[PDB]
Amino acid sequence: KNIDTVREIITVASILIKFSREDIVENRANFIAFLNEIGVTHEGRKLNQNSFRKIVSELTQEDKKTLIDEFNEGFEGVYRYLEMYTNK
DNA sequence: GAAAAGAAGCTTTGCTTAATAATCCATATGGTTATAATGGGAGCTGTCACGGATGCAGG
C-alpha cells in the first residue's frame, strides 16, 4: 500500500540527515520539491502538501511502530553510546 | 453511457511567531562624607621513632 511509499520517504530522510545535510528536512516545501525531483510517486503522480499530510495521516499505529523501528536501525552507533551512560 | 464522488490544484485565514521599537533598571563608578577614634589572635598543649642537618665547643 502507501506504507511502502512512506518507507522510501523515511529511508530517503535517513540518508538525508545521515550525510550531514540537515536543513532540507525541517523546511517542508523544499523537502517535497527534493522528493519530487528524485522521483518518488504515490498513485502515479507527484507529492502535494495535502497529499503528504494525508499519507502521513492515513496510517496505522503498528505500522508507525514498524517505521520508527526500521528507522532506528541505521542509527545504532548513536544509540549504543546514548544508553551506555544511562544504565542507572 | 450517465452521475455522484473524490482528488489536484488554486485560493484564503485565523493563528503564531520572530523581528524590532520602547523602556527601565541593574550596575558601575565616583564622590563624599571633615570633633575625635593610634600594635591581633588562635596559637595545642596526650605521639613517635628515626634521622640528618645544624649547632656549639674544646683541643
Curated annotation (Swiss-Prot):
Signal peptide range in chain numbering: none
Assembly, per entry: Interacts with the host sigma factor RpoD, and thereby inhibits its interaction with the catalytic core of the host RNA polymerase.
Highest rank taxon of the organism: Viruses
Protein keywords: Transcription, Transcription regulation
Gene3D superfamilies to which the protein is assigned, alphabetical: Anti-Sigma Factor A (1.10.1810.10)
Xref: InterPro entries: AsiA, AsiA_sf
Function field: Transcriptional inhibitor. Inhibits sigma 70-directed transcription by weakening its interaction with the core of the host's RNA polymerase. This allows Gp55 to successfully compete for the core enzyme. Plays an important role during the prereplicative period of phage T4 development.
Name by which UniProt lists this protein: 10 kDa anti-sigma factor
Gene Ontology BP terms: regulation of DNA-templated transcription
The keyword Transcription regulation is assigned to this record: yes
Organism: Enterobacteria phage T4
Pfam family, one: AsiA
Coiled coil: none
